[PDB]
């Protein structure tokens, strides 16, 4: 199966997922000087007050914090989006060292990690239907840099010892994802794809300009997770990021002047 190693990583994915070489792949480098303010963007609304987290899962690639998306409880609206997008899960991508780990880059700069809050367009009824549509998903991306600790991340960090290996899950109720957001909602947006197989071109990306700070100790705990299953030789879960892909016939728009 696909992964991040030398023999099954991003440079190999195209052989089973030919869309890997497609016209709107993600992530991309965000050239901050070429990105243009877009007055047609509406105010962005992140409405997570009633979010219901359920479970945290090590899926062998990353860990997902899953939400009850059976009804409109945490949603994303506004900005570039037409209609209502429901939060289904969040996860991260990170590096083996602080100097890499993000998927998007900013003027070629790599951050230590990147948080993805994944939402599906409720007009399509379910996630599987949404990923058949050009506007099926919206992913809110947030960069992580290493400095002061992020208090709202600590509950995540502290459960990771219980989901060390692929296929393990744990209860993760009553987690507030609002504690993972920076102060500012300034953002860049562009049309793209899932960054892992199946690489489907369904995503409106909304990437916040302001990174959150996390402590070295917090990201070191991410790096103690395992790609492998229980009992198998240890492969540390690190460098689970896809590099930037060609921008092709796209423009990145900014929410800020
Ligand atoms: N294309 S891919 O990354 O999914 C892949 C490989 F490259 C190699 C082996 C199995 C496999 F699934
Ligand atoms: N990393 S990402 O947010 O683009 C993403 C998802 F949300 C869901 C599935 C695959 C995937 F790649
Ligand atoms: O427990 C995490 C969050 O869950 C939500 O459903 C509640 O409405 C919030 O008040 C709370 O912060
Ligand atoms: O033709 C002019 C237009 O070109 C487009 O590529 C830009 O996105 C618009 O902002 C601009 O008004
Ligand atoms: O909020 C997420 C989780 O944080 C802590 O692990 C709590 O002990 C647990 O009860 C809760 O589910
Ligand atoms: Zn992701």
From Swiss-Prot:
Optimum pH is 6-8. Changing residue 194 to E/H/R: Strongly reduced CO(2) hydrase activity. Its main location: cytoplasm. The active site is at residue 61. Pfam families: Carb_anhydrase. Changing residue 116 to D/N/Q: Reduced activity. Belongs to the alpha-carbonic anhydrase family. It is found in: Cytoplasm; Cell membrane. Changing residue 114 to Q: Strongly reduced activity and sulfonamide affinity. The record marks 89 as: Involved in the binding of some activators, including histamine and L-histidine. Residues 1-256 form the Alpha-carbonic anhydrase domain. Interacts with SLC4A4. Interaction with SLC4A7 regulates SLC4A7 transporter activity. Interacts with SLC26A6 isoform 4 (via C-terminus cytoplasmic domain). It is linked to Osteopetrosis, autosomal recessive 3: A rare genetic disease characterized by abnormally dense bone, due to defective resorption of immature bone. Osteopetrosis occurs in two forms: a severe autosomal recessive form occurring in utero, infancy, or childhood, and a benign autosomal dominant form occurring in adolescence or adulthood. Recessive osteopetrosis commonly manifests in early infancy with macrocephaly, feeding difficulties, evolving blindness and deafness, bone marrow failure, severe anemia, and hepatosplenomegaly. Changing residue 62 to F: Reduced activity. Changing residue 139 to F/Y: Strongly impaired activity. One of its GO terms (cellular component) is cytoplasm. It comes from the Eukaryota. Zn(2+) binds at residues 91, 93, 116. The keyword Phosphoprotein applies. GO terms for biological process: angiotensin-activated signaling pathway; carbon dioxide transport; morphogenesis of an epithelium; neuron cellular homeostasis; positive regulation of cellular pH reduction; positive regulation of dipeptide transmembrane transport; positive regulation of synaptic transmission, GABAergic; regulation of chloride transport. Changing residue 89 to P: In OPTB3; in Czechoslovakia. Changing residue 61 to W: Impaired activity, rescued by 4-methylimidazole (4-MI). Impaired activity, not rescued by 4-methylimidazole (4-MI). This is Carbonic anhydrase 2. Changing residue 103 to D: Normal CO(2) hydrase activity. The gene is CA2.
């Amino acid at each position: 199966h696909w992964g991040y190693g030398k023999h099954n990583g991003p440079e190999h994915w195209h052989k089973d997922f030919p869309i890997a070489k497609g016209e709107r792949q993600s992530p991309v480098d965000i050239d901050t000087h070429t990105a243009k303010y877009d007055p047609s963007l509406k105010p962005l609304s992140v409405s997570y007050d009633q979010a219901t987290s359920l479970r945290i899962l090590n899926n062998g690639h990353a860990f997902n914090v899953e939400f009850d998306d059976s009804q409109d409880k945490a949603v994303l609206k506004g900005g570039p989006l037409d209609g209502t997008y429901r939060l289904i899960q969040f996860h991260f991508h990170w590096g083996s060292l602080d100097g890499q780990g993000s998927e998007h880059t900013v003027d070629k700069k790599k951050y230590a990690a990147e948080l993805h809050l994944v939402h599906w367009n409720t007009k399509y009824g379910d996630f599987g239907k949404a990923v058949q549509q050009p506007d099926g998903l919206a992913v809110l991306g947030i960069f992580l840099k290493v400095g002061s600790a992020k208090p709202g991340l600590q509950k995540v960090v502290d459960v990771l010892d219980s989901i060390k290996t692929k296929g393990k899950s744990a209860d993760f109720t009553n987690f507030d994802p609002r504690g993972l957001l920076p102060e500012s909602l300034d953002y860049w947006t562009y049309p793209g794809s899932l960054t892992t197989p199946p690489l489907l071109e369904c995503v409106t990306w909304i990437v916040l300009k302001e990174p959150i700070s996390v402590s070295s100790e917090q990201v070191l705990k991410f790096r103690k997770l395992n790609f492998n299953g229980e009992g198998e030789p240890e492969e540390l879960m690190v460098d689970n990021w896809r590099p930037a892909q060609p921008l092709k016939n796209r423009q990145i728009k900014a929410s800020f002047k």
